Amino acid sequence: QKPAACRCSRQDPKNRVNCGFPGITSDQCFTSGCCFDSQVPGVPWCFKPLPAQESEECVMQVSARKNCGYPGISPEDCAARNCCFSDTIPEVPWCFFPMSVEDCHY
């Protein structure tokens, strides 16, 4: 169902991964659980969204993560400094700064 904007907004157009069959409409794309955008040329207009998070300020591409914790920092201690926490991808910052959800459009 319509992924929230930052899951869409926050991806680099060159890293979009196709979603939907070809000629799928805005609505079918969004309701397929993907992102529609018809303003950037040359890239998929119906693409898969970023993995969600509890807060949308924490949603970005793994590479845009700036470290905010330290090896082993607890999810509780990571929250105390008002940082995001995500232990799903290995070998990247599990505690990183969030980014103000505002750049986030469709």
Swiss-Prot record:
A molecular-function term among this protein's GO annotations: CXCR4 chemokine receptor binding
Its tissue distribution reads: Found in pancreas.
Keyword entries, A-Z: Disulfide bond, Growth factor, Pyrrolidone carboxylic acid, Repeat, Secreted, Signal
Gene Ontology CC terms, in alphabetical order: extracellular space
Where do the P-type domain residues begin and end? 6-50, 56-99
Q: Which GO terms describe its biological process?
A: chemokine-mediated signaling pathway; maintenance of gastrointestinal epithelium; negative regulation of gastric acid secretion
Q: Is-annotated flag, keyword Repeat?
A: yes
Query: Where are the bilayer-spanning segments?
Result: none
Compartments, record wording: Secreted
- Any S-S bridges, and between which cysteines? C6-C104, C8-C35, C19-C34, C29-C46, C58-C84, C68-C83, C78-C95
Indicate yes or no for the key word Disulfide bond. Answer: yes
Functionally, this protein is described as follows: Inhibits gastrointestinal motility and gastric acid secretion. Could function as a structural component of gastric mucus, possibly by stabilizing glycoproteins in the mucus gel through interactions with carbohydrate side chains.
What is the protein name for this chain? Trefoil factor 2
Q: Whose protein is this, by species?
A: Sus scrofa
Q: Which gene encodes it?
A: TFF2
